Amino acid sequence: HADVEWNVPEKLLKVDIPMALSASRAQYECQYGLIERPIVKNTEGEEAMFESCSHRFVRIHDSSYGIGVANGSTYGSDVSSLRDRDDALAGTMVRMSLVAAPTAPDPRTDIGHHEFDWTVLPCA
Amino acid sequence: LKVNREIDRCKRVMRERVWPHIHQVLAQCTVGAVKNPGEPEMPAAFITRAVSGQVIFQPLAVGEPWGTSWGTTWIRVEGQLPETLPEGRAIELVFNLGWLEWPVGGHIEAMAYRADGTVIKALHPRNHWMPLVSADGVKDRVVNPDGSFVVYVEGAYNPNVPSFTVTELGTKPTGKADERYEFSSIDIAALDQDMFDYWADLDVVTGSLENMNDADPRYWKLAKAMQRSINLWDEKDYNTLALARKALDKVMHNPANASAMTLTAMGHSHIDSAWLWPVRETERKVGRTVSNALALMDIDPDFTYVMSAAQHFAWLEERHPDLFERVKARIAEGRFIPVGGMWVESDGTMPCGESLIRQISYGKRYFKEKLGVVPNGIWLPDSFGYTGAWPQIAKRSGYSWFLTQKLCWNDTTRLPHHSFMWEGVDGSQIFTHFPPADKYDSDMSANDMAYVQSNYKDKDLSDRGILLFGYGDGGGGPIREMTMREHRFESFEGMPKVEYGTPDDFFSKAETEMKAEAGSEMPRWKGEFYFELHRKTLTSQQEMKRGCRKEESMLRTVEYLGVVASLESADYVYPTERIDRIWKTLLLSQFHDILPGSAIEWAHRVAREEYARDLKALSDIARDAIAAIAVANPDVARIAKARISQFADVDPWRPASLVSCGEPVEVNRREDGSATLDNGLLCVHVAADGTVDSMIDLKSGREMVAKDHVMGRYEILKDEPGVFDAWDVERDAFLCATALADGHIVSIETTADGSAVIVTKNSYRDDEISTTITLRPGKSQLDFHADVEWNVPEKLLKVDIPMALSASRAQYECQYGLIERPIVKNTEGEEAMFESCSHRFVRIHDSSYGIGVANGSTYGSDVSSLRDRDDALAGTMVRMSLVAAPTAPDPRTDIGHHEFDWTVLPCASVAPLVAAAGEINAPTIENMPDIAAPITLEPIEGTPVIDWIKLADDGSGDIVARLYEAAGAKAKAMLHVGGTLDGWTVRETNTLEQDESYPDEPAGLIGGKQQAEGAELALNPFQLTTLRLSRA
Amino acid sequence: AMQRSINLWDEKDYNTLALARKALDKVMHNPANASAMTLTAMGHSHIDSAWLWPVRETERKV
Amino acid sequence: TTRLPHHSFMWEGVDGSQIFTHFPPADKYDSDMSANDMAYVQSNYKDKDLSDRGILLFGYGD
Ligand SMILES: [Zn+2]
Ligand SMILES: [Zn+2]
């Protein structure tokens, strides 16, 4: 549970959740049901999906295990693979966007005191 | 415009006013020849027989074909080498035997020998000349004290075989001269180096005007000098030549641009081990190409040449012993480079994991004892896609980089990058590069420079590429015209910088600089390289695909028995050499032209009867080894019809039998023709016309057949493609398929064991399909076995399996592991994947259930969703291709009597599917005593599978097991060993059975070398580890 | 280099300016091609002595 | 309708006397010394095979 006192414009904040489980696709939820999107983006069109929506949770799983993260009010995230310092596969990074501060139609947008809540679970 | 019309004048000047005045003809030679349309003999045995008296050499006829198709003509040439030869000029023979120009390695070739059995140089369409004197007063050894000399020429009258066209040429020696090639006066000529340099300069200059734009002033400063020169050269006054070259010099020395790329050029000729010619011809092709390569290492230094396919080196060792010691002299020098240690350039997707590992091993072994080299990367420029398990195998085999180019022919999509990091399913990554020229056989033209620099897909952060040149696909190598137009492109402002180099150094520096430059932005590709072309190569010649699996699936049994018999009986010699010969013969029939089945009728005929011979020879090593175990354990038990299938459901390598041993299977014939098979675990209902139409999983209580569909319906597609008949499938065919609704049940019966069988018949206008559906007691799977009497060409057969389970992706298997591909293809690039490979099974599953289908020899399939007649979702259709009949290189391909086997399972997890695939692909043997396996793992968690228990190759007596993980989840297990090898140690190796560790690769064992009994194993998803057990 | 520079200049921290210019320097010093033309530049402004204004204005324009 | 063939040439009158004439290849006297003008000057100059020399005027004119 985080309390932010955002004051600087033209910046974007987000937190990360590095998971020790590696898979080829990530699992989000829809209004009713679920979808999966690639993690490693191969073609030119896939690299255009570098940030995506997520209602209330994101799950990275395999045949027999999985780790999930559920949020309160974020609505945004992105996933990518993680590589160890000796350059072996480590897991998957799940970053979820918390608060941004544009300037174009609103000069003073999103200034001060935002709350955020989330939770991490091991879930088969 | 005036310039474009000035280019034509310059090209015609090159072709007529400059080119002929290079070889000044001095005198012509007397000739006599002997023809032979049979199979050729070894040259060494002919020369010594042709020196004493035993050949007559009746003279040739000027203007007639000098041979017959697939024949050999030996020609004895005698000249005089007269006096008054021009000063400081080279003297060489010129062989103009009626050459064409388009195919270099396709039509006739030749090879010139000395009168002791030694090779001089080979003769090809664009490279037909032999050095007599080298413009320096030194003569070749074949010159008498006077000008007399004598040459023997072995000429191969190979016909030109079209790629896709019905023909009778690729069958057998005809004895007739179909394509006429004349003789036309072999002669002697003096070479003019200055005119030759002038022609080279003109060629370099005039080829750059087609590729520049009329915006830089260089385009105009060039086209002016080209015009001033050819306006100054008068072929009737030699003194003007020196005037013409000086005009075309104010533009030849201009330093390259600041940002221009840098290309590393190496000579390279690709030889397809068997395609459009018999395999008895490839040996001579390798010989000719290599001889050409060494005759170009004395035209200029600093020229480098690469060569792959250790099998080619072996073929060269046996046929030209003298030409072998000249190669090794260059290897130690550093200009001749053997690359990519492998037996042959195998296929990239079809062979199993053990095939690839054995190829790498045999190649590395040959490159060590003979040449003394250790390659660092895999050389595979020509292949119909790549499996996706390649990165892990390569990294765990000691390799560092990877090379491909064939993936440019994709019909829909272009890959994003040329240099990138390729990560497999396991997670290991390998640096991969495509040559930007989009072809391995370049001619070092200006067109190729312009294309390389203007097509390279990573010009912002790499500015470094590779460039291969030479005449390939049939041999021939590079010609001396290519090398002397390389020194012109060294700087040549307007074009990339070019320099010679070796592949290892280029790859090292390119990878390291691209890494240290890009940062954590390095391009990356995870998955497999699906080839969007040539879909029919998965089913082109079925007897080749069935042969590759049946031989290899039983090499596993034969090698396992050698382990069991070498532990039981105290005296039993394991036949290493026979097995090695069989393995090499197998790896030769997995070339990228003969496993896809796209070669002439002759090549497949030979390769087909090899599978028959080695299958028979293999099942005599087996029964001779089983005889040893039979005397060591003389009273335990013996069962007929056993099958050692790795990873069963209860006992992994125990030899299970074929007698099912359950309670009988109740059969309920109905009056309308339908029947109802029902064992304890399934309730199958077969309709009146084959085609199971409902299958109940009595354990869970779920329908297994998609509603309003029937399982077993045969379709026959109408595939008549545009080009590459034996290669690819139109999408149009998928629209034209017609089901065989007619049919009936021929017989319903039960057998002695208690299983139930149903025998069906089906026909389409000439041919017959008779299926046998079996239900065995105590097995939750349905077995199909079909016998086809295929007779109609230009058709394609396949069966369908409609599944009552709907998902968004389908699951196939790779060499080691699994992959998933979409079912509903959304984008334009996805619709290009309408047919795909599948080794041994396909699974359609969801969160809590799944249905799988395993096959025996098919290798091909495609999936799509199924929609009910009221237009609600029904399930998924799985169709797998059985047999096709092209016509292009083989007029009579795949005619008559094919067999097929497959099985369908309900499987929540993947373990029973793997067990069923292993159990359906295993061969049968007789009188096999049932004894527990020596190596066993008790699964604490996950699904680890021991694949290839075998003996060591060092002859020391160790055991080597290759175990992996086949579920996609981490697996923990521990090792249990039988009472025959207690006290033994265990340790971890690489795939080549050597004590080498790599920091970027996880290991299986926990610890080091320790006692075998009780050692534990942890395997991260899709990991491949190798255990070695030693007596001490 | 154009992309690397503007990704480095933050108008709320002046010390980053010196960092941004150094990125847009690995490409500013590259010698012209061998065959490039040569142009002789001179400052020149053409004054139409009378057009779209009275002639009493051209004097001030000069 | 028509473009003249050359930018630098010898202009001979009715009498027979000749004078050396040049057009600035930028096709305008008021240039702003932009990259567009460099690209245009080098890619439009009509005698690049034997002259490789041109003039370039810049400033706000008219
Ligand atoms: Zn090839
Ligand atoms: Zn004016």
Instruction: Provide, as residue numbers in chain B, all residues whose Cβ is less than 8 Å from the Cβ of A40.
Output: 423, 524, 526-527
Encoded tokens for D25: 């290849």
**Cα B142 from Cα B152, distance rounded (Å):** 11
Secondary structure class of B509 (helix, strand, coil) = helix
**Cα A89 from Cα A22, distance rounded (Å):** 8
Beta-ladder partners of B337: B306
């592991």: which residue's tokens? B817
Burial B199-224 (b: 16+ CB within 10 A, else e): bbbbbbbbbbbebbeeebbbbbbbbb
B288 φ, ψ to 5°?
Answer: -60, -50
**Cα B479 from Cα B129, distance rounded (Å):** 11
- Residues with their C more than 2.5 Å from the N of the next written residue in chain A, i.e. before a break, are none
C window 1-60, beta carbon within 8 A of D: 35-48
The helix (H) or strand (E) run that includes residue B349 is: none
**Cα B318 from Cα B321, distance rounded (Å):** 6
B362 HSE (CA, 13 A, CB side): 26
Instruction: Provide, as residue numbers in chain B, all residues whose Cβ is less than 8 Å from the Cβ of A43.
Output: 413, 416, 829
CA dihedral B458, B462, B463, B467 (to 10 degrees): -80
Neighbours of chain A (3+ CB pairs under 8 A): B
Encoded tokens for B67: 């041979």
Find the radius of gyration of the CA atoms of chain D.
13
> Is residue B910 a contact partner of residue B966, using CB atoms and an 8 Å limit?
yes
**Cα B467 from Cα B778, distance rounded (Å):** 61
- Interface check for B217 against chain D (CB to CB < 8 A): the answer is yes
Q: How far is CA D27 from CA B217, B753, C46, D38, D44, in A?
A: 18, 98, 14, 12, 9
**Cα B266 from Cα B470, distance rounded (Å):** 9
Between strands B860-867 and B836-837, the pairing is antiparallel
Instruction: Provide, as residue numbers in chain D, all residues whose Cβ is less than 8 Å from the Cβ of B223.
Output: 49
**Cα A115 from Cα A104, distance rounded (Å):** 24
Instruction: Determine whether the interchain pair B218/C33 forms a contact, defined as Cβ–Cβ distance below 8 Å.
Output: yes
Resolution (A): 2.9
Between helices B193-208 and B2-12, what is the axis angle to 10°? 150
Residue type at B143 in one-letter notation: V
Instruction: Determine whether the interchain pair D49/B215 forms a contact, defined as Cβ–Cβ distance below 8 Å.
Output: no
Question: Which ligand has the nearest atom to the CA of B346?
Answer: 1
Between strands B842-845 and B419-423, the pairing is unpaired
> Is residue B392 a contact partner of residue B424, using CB atoms and an 8 Å limit?
yes
Residue type at B524 in one-letter notation: R
Beta-ladder partners of B511: none
Instruction: Determine whether the interchain pair B215/D43 forms a contact, defined as Cβ–Cβ distance below 8 Å.
Output: yes
**Cα B1020 from Cα B970, distance rounded (Å):** 4
B644 HSE (CA, 13 A, CB side): 27
**Cα B944 from Cα B964, distance rounded (Å):** 6
Does C29 belong to an annotated binding site?
no
Between strands B860-867 and B744-750, the pairing is unpaired
Q: How far is CA B149 from CA B63, B86, B601, B697, B789, in A?
A: 25, 19, 42, 85, 62
CA triple B544-B545-B550, angle to 5 deg: 95
Instruction: Provide, as residue numbers in chain A, all residues whose Cβ is less than 8 Å from the Cβ of B1000.
Output: 86-88
Find the radius of gyration of the CA atoms of chain C.
22
**Cα B141 from Cα B131, distance rounded (Å):** 11
Residue B591 is given by DSSP the state: B
**Cα B981 from Cα B1012, distance rounded (Å):** 9
**Cα B420 from Cα B458, distance rounded (Å):** 9
CA triple B900-B904-B905, angle to 5 deg: 150
């000439």: which residue's tokens? B766
Secondary structure class of B47 (helix, strand, coil) = helix
**Cα B997 from Cα B254, distance rounded (Å):** 50
Nearest to B618 by CA among B544, B561, B669, B534: B561
**Cα B564 from Cα B935, distance rounded (Å):** 10
Nearest CB to C44; choose among D48, D52, D57:
D57
Contacts within 8 Å (CB) and 24+ apart, B507-515: B507/B376, B507/B377, B507/B400, B507/B401, B507/B431, B507/B433, B509/B464, B510/B419, B510/B433, B510/B462, B510/B464, B511/B401, B511/B419, B511/B431, B513/B464, B514/B419, B514/B458, B514/B461, B514/B462, B514/B464
Task: Give A72: exposed, middle or buried? Use CB within 10 Å, 0-12, 13-18, 19+.
Answer: exposed
**Cα B115 from Cα B121, distance rounded (Å):** 13
Torsion region of B177: left, alpha or beta (phi above 0 gives left; psi -120 to 50 gives alpha):
beta
Beta-ladder partners of A5: none
**Cα B547 from Cα B614, distance rounded (Å):** 10
Residue of D nearest to B221 (CA): D49
> Is residue B88 a contact partner of residue B135, using CB atoms and an 8 Å limit?
yes
Between strands A76-83 and A52-53, the pairing is antiparallel
**Cα B749 from Cα B469, distance rounded (Å):** 65
Between helices B601-632 and B279-294, what is the axis angle to 10°? 110
């008021």: which residue's tokens? D30
B994 HSE (CA, 13 A, CB side): 9
**Cα B1025 from Cα B398, distance rounded (Å):** 14
């390095």: which residue's tokens? B522
**Cα B967 from Cα B204, distance rounded (Å):** 58
Between strands A2-4 and A114-116, the pairing is antiparallel
Encoded tokens for B1023: 């990991």
Residue B15 is given by DSSP the state: I
Nearest CB to B967; choose among A63, A81, A89:
A63
Are 3 or more Cβ–Cβ pairs between A and D shorter than 8 Å?
Answer: no
Secondary structure class of B194 (helix, strand, coil) = helix
Residue B791 is given by DSSP the state: -
How far away, in angstroms, is C46 Cα from ligand 2 center? 6
Nearest to B545 by CA among B598, B582, B602, B583: B598
The helix (H) or strand (E) run that includes residue B550 is: helix B542-568
**Cα B280 from Cα B602, distance rounded (Å):** 10
The helix (H) or strand (E) run that includes residue B393 is: helix B390-396
Encoded tokens for D55: 């003039």
Q: How far is CA B608 from CA B278, B589, B605, B691, B882, in A?
A: 13, 9, 5, 33, 18
**Cα B362 from Cα B343, distance rounded (Å):** 6
Secondary structure class of B159 (helix, strand, coil) = coil
D21 HSE (CA, 13 A, CB side): 13
Q: Work out the number of other CB atoms within 10 angstroms of the CB of residue D36.
A: 11
Task: Give A107: exposed, middle or buried? Use CB within 10 Å, 0-12, 13-18, 19+.
Answer: exposed
Residue type at B577 in one-letter notation: E
A6 HSE (CA, 13 A, CB side): 23
> Is residue B474 a contact partner of residue B104, using CB atoms and an 8 Å limit?
yes
> Is residue B90 a contact partner of residue B134, using CB atoms and an 8 Å limit?
yes
Between strands B336-338 and B305-307, the pairing is parallel
Q: Work out the number of other CB atoms within 10 angstroms of the CB of residue A16.
A: 13
Strands, DSSP E only, in B318-440? 336-338, 377-379, 401-403, 419-423, 429-433
CA triple B163-B164-B166, angle to 5 deg: 115
**Cα B21 from Cα B86, distance rounded (Å):** 14
Burial B96-113 (b: 16+ CB within 10 A, else e): ebbbeeebbbbbbbbbbb
> Is residue B827 a contact partner of residue B804, using CB atoms and an 8 Å limit?
no
Residue of B nearest to D40 (CA): B215
User: How long is chain D?
Assistant: 62
Instruction: Determine whether the interchain pair D62/C42 forms a contact, defined as Cβ–Cβ distance below 8 Å.
Output: no
Q: Work out the number of other CB atoms within 10 angstroms of the CB of residue B116.
A: 12
**Cα B401 from Cα B254, distance rounded (Å):** 35
**Cα B435 from Cα B448, distance rounded (Å):** 11
Count CB pairs under 8 A between chains C and D. Answer: 48
**Cα B244 from Cα B248, distance rounded (Å):** 7
Residue B252 is given by DSSP the state: T
Secondary structure class of B922 (helix, strand, coil) = coil
């028509």: which residue's tokens? D2
Residue type at B869 in one-letter notation: R
Encoded tokens for B254: 């201009």
